[model samples]
Target: SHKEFTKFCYEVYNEIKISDKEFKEKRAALDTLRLCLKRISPDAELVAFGSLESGLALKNSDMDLCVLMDSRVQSDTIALQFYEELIAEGFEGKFLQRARIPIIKLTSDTKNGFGASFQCDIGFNNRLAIHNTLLLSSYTKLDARLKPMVLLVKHWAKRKQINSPYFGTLSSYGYVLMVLYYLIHVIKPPVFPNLLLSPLKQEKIVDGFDVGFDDKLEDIPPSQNYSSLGSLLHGFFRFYAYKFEPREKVVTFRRPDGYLTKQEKGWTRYILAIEDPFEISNNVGRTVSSSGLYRIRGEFMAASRLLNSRSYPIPYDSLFEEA
Candidate 1:
């Protein structure tokens, strides 16, 4: 029965959800980090934006953060300072000066003050990423099912070794958006309304590109689909596994989804095209190569089979095991 899968998801959730103590410690560490950034420049700011802020983080999820610096402040200099400071505190991070982008990678080599067993890439002047983070946070709040479903999928992807972009797979953000697209546009009776596609709300157009929505606490109604996490997970894997035409369909969260075809946007070259919510020109899945798509879709098929099947397979147990 489908009830079995729902109960299975509940068991996985109980095993992997972030604990209250760890959450508090991470918040405290973030506060300390903000002070550290303040030392670099009064104008410079550091903020946690992704899974940590979105309430969907698993036990070992990275404290995904962004470094925001004003144009007046030298972003490169700020990046260097933050990198040096983090290293001076006796940690592992490399200020990759050779890279084209002015960025730094801070890695938690060992247990820290916050139990923050994670690494994050710090990018400069990423206003759109911040807005997208707010959008993701809102989606998590809008539906009770979104977080659990995402967490389970995230775990599955990690276990299957398809969550690494450098290794020719999708990033965490790309997977999140796919799940969001599935809930919003694919499923009948959506889990989340198109929050980013609204024109009625306050809009910001920076350099002739839509940055994102107002990112408000708009009293969005509950999800029309009261589906269980197991059901959503089962469908999500199958949707990406077979239904999604990666080359033709542009996964979008905006309203009036008329121009989302590959021909309409000139995104026909890729095996997968997922538009960044704020940076419409940027395809989040652009990092994925041809072989990467095969691995991703293959894992989806395997997961779908496991989740939908009644058999208690050994590999399926490993699929949802905590990282």
Candidate 2:
């Protein structure tokens, strides 16, 4: 039954969720890194983003830190200096000097070399990523079902081999946006009201993009949609597999209608266009190549079919079987 599968989803979520010990370890690492950065740029502030901040983190999730520098200092100088400092501190990582957005990645050699438990990516001045983290975390808090549903969706993507952004597939972040889009826009009587569309006390413009949203959860009423987690999960796959016309339309949360056409956005190059809620011009799904889109659609169709059938045991294992 879908009910039983839903229960399975919850169990897997609990099994993979981060623990207090893990949280403390990450905090310790963050504190140590902060002190090191303090030696280099006293005015630079370190902030967190990605899964750790978003509350959708799995046990093995890595820390994503960003260094926000004061205008008095130059970012290029700080990036190279930080890489040198991290190396001296016994962390093994790469500094992407030529990337559109520079990033410093660390492997946990500082955990006393070799057994490497910590994996972190530090970026410079990524304010928009931080904002998106807060937005996603807020949505996680609004409904009990959302967390488990997203966890399962992400986990399924991992199992299906479709979560690798480097290999022309969607990222975990992109998948999360897709789930939020479904709840806030596609589902009947929506599980979440479009928080971006909800009234804001004042508009906020960050990086020349409108970043305001109603974060006051108390003002919003509880959702009327009572669909079971399994039902919603089934619908999510079906929607993306068949209903969504990737080439013709865009997945957007900014509009009242929840979607926009590629023609309207002049975004026809990509196989899928998932609008960044904060970075309006950025398409989150730009990484998906044509072959990748074909594979992803095939996986969605299979999952939807499995969940739609009237099987006795619900084919839970079969649905999540690694490709």
Candidate 3:
């Protein structure tokens, strides 16, 4: 049974991991973009935030970058500068000037001659996400199981078409938070120890966000659970389906037990409250609508049943099939 489960996890890892060559190419592209963004203003700063920096990236995951110009550069102006610089330099990009905050989307066609293209969404002054991203990266390192499990879950979520927050579903980041919450709080003996909730010690704060935590795997004691990824995966779906009280409780990592009730935090409007580690007031799951809640819960039920299947397609493919 171990052999069969390990075999499946190995195959899933291969599917989700980026080739070493591609990783290097992606890094180079982002570096070039960072330099270009810095040219906008001497006071401006550009940094990669999400999967790129967190090292949880898939082969096709976009490079999520953010620029911090402080009060010197207005949000709309940041997008305009990015737009003007790209066009003049013979690059292709779109500057979206809507809402209070603006964003610039760009497509970089492998200028590295590596011929591996990348798309990046550059946002303005989102310093808090950087903290949360590092929080995830540290959690992944605290245990061997977290990285593989998270990547597999993300791939599964994408396949199920429930990873898009804009499409009346959850975002990949939100699902990631869900997985981390389960491991830290729900399971016995826990796959990984809590970082933010740890009473041991504390990364310095970035802006108003706390970046303190012990990330070295050697520093953390080993988990006694010894559960295989497959078993934990099934439990994940089951726990969310039958036990989790989304309307009453929340998924929180920056707490003693990785939990905080909605009534305590006064976040009672939404169906779910997924607290952001750094932006404590922010609910990452706020985008999930009533329909999204129904669909997500439905998918959870289906996954739990199929995870018990002994056959091929039902155990894996069907679980990940696009809705």
Candidate 4:
């Protein structure tokens, strides 16, 4: 029992450092959201996402949750109604409106030592069972390939301990998403293959209202290197990118030490080899750009050239060979 308790304590401590007033406020907000969801749809489940679920919430981190409904509930109207109820229940802070998807925002009290008012996003899904099951299954499949890469990049980030030029004004999740997008698009040809392959069919809820998956890929440049040779070489280089060299970049945000700030500026750069899971040995040396933003063109050019030259799929075990 003590071991279990200790494990739980360590987990919470790792997620939000103890003695953090902001984190306490966030917990309170989550509790409020849980209460609201239970009252509205007692059978519905709440799932956390982003940094909060990933155990990476910083001092100014916001809590994100999904108010998933059963498949029988086909409309997001229920989510909106729940949001309105929450507003009436005393969440009258900075309410950010999302017309595309229903969401509610509640700010922390600035004068109450809550640091920054944390954001709690409530997303509703009609295909709750399908979404959760698919997400869990997909994560299991992708994690085998992606988690190693995540650890590698995270390690490199910690080693450099600075900002990067390749990802300007982006959080770690942003960079991670970019990397995921690139790998999925280039290697598999679609970042979200499952979503792409099985597009959601619409189901009518009310007159002129339907709910379904959009099936559209988020906007990103088309892959320039799309040849068989390119794919093979990308596979090869992913294996050794981490071994090439290391670089570091320092970035100062608008806030010196906050979740988000506008008055921050600084610079640093570090170089390190990072692996691409989709393709082995095609490791790329990622570094922070000195120019305060990511040099996407330069990196893409280098990757394209490397990919264009190889024509054979290197064995996965032999991906460590120097390029």
Candidate 5:
């Protein structure tokens, strides 16, 4: 039964997963934009982040680029100026400045509008995102199954319409964090070693939280977990559906044993508390409202039940069918 499920997921993963050709195109496209930005401001540099950088991206995943530069150049100033330049170039997107950080949403096809192929968000001076990207990339390198599991979960979320943080649900990044938390903390004989708690521990204070993690991947021991992909997926759904106490527990990848309590983290207000591994104080699930959490939990429970029953010809399409 487990083998069958794994086989199905394997087929789906190959269909939706990113390829080297796609990777090259995205790199070149971003590289062109980076060069354009350099022409505008000689000191600025653009770097890719989010799912694409982490190697957990779907074939059509949106790009996230951060403009890193000296503080001498104000973030908003450069961001607005860049947005104006791109707008003049006939790029069709919005320059949203009201958020925590100014973001310039852009698409390659101006006529087709946003969500046209090659959609990407450009944020200025996002140092935290760079380290977080590296953290996730390192974890992906440690295990092969991790990537597929994340991609499947994200795909399901998208199809179910529960992946948008702005729409009172969780972001793709939030889902990625949840997946890592499951493998590193929830599952027994842990599928991944806690790199944040590594012996090569070094600390770099970024926004008051230690952004430091073991950069030396050679020292981290290999996983003892031999569970198949299907079994792991079933367990993942079950864990989130029932075992995880979202209201009381704060999911954190920095720890080896036990979770950070809501009271301890002062995250009692959020319906689901998921701590950002690097930004310990930030709850990644803060975007999830009470209603959104209810829908999310229900989706997990349904998926768990589907995976648990009817071993033959697992209704894989029904599992991801839109709610």
Candidate 6:
């Protein structure tokens, strides 16, 4: 069964070859970004983020890089300088300083213009280090520990591939992440708590704990049936269809002062409406839809955790041993 599944995945990957020209273009763009940073601040380090670093990138996925400056550099000033230099160099690009950090956007100007078609956002490292690494790393480690179990369930899904309407549209990565989330919060009870709700009780540091979810969940009794790997795996998949409801919220926003009055003064609506882009949309209509595929994906993760118990090892040990 595993052999068949692996074969199918390989066939799919092989059919989707990376074009040489496009590959070169992506590499060139990355090189330019790196070189520009070096020329501006040689001591600074550049790091990759998002799908690329996480190994979850699709074939056409764009690269995301951040320029991490040394403590000596002022984030705002450095960002503005970087923006101006790129424009002055005749590099066809756009830069914005809307948020606390500056963002540089670059596009390729090559023949056929296919090489640099992907847009990359360059931001200061203060934002990346403070938020992205901490939040993303914790989730990634959790996913890694649970992957074996995910693959096992994926094997089961593959056998039913032809008949299952949920095949292909849901990616292995997405399914795997959802399954990991569900296992701790749902079937495995007390093992993993709901992440969004847990933070209200205590400040949870990303790298400090072996478990990312709340401690209260850890106090729950282990499943009476999870005495062996086989039984746990079997039972896990059986409960994979169970749905866990999300906490609801009511979001409200008010329009800025003089919206109608400002429009009559020949001021662009864009500036007046900057604070609330969804003002007109939310006022006119609202609709909600659930992802049937994502629900299955979440169940698969929980089922996988039944067999794979490595979800939250001590962060230090996990990183050190891997290194």
Q: Number of the top candidate by lDDT?
A: 2
lDDT of 2 by residue, 64-162 (tens): 999998755668888989889989988888989665577898976764433376688999998899998989988888998888888888889988999
In terms of lDDT, the poorest run of 10 residues in model 4 is 249-258
lDDT of 1 at 316: 46
Question: Model 1, residue 311: displacement in angstroms?
Answer: 5.4
Tens-digit lDDT string for candidate 3 (193-258): 777656665657676667676655576788888888878887898998888988789898767776
lDDT of each: 0.75, 0.85, 0.76, 0.41, 0.84, 0.43
| Alpha-carbon RMSD, each predicted model | 3.0, 1.8, 2.9, 15.8, 2.3, 14.8
Candidate 4: deviation at residue 223, Å?
Answer: 31
Q: lDDT per residue, candidate 5, 1-323, as tens digits? A: 58878998999998888988788778877766766697679888899998888898888778899998897767888788888777775566788886658898886656323334658899888889999999999988889889999999999999888898988899888998888888988788899878888777798997677899887887778899999999899989999999998888888875678568888877763888888888877888989988999999999999998988766666877877876
Between candidates 1 and 6, name the one with more favorable TM-score.
1
lDDT of 1 by residue, 24-77 (tens): 877876776777777777876777777888887888656667787667756677
Best by TM-score: 2
Instruction: Indicate the TM-score of model 2.
Output: 0.94
Candidate 1, residue 19: the lDDT equals 85
Prediction 4 TM-score vs. true: 0.40
Q: Which regions of candidate 4 are displaced past 4 Å?
A: 1-25, 93-100, 109-116, 126-171, 177-323
Give me the overall lDDT of model 4.
0.41
For candidate 1, the per-residue lDDT at 119 reads: 65
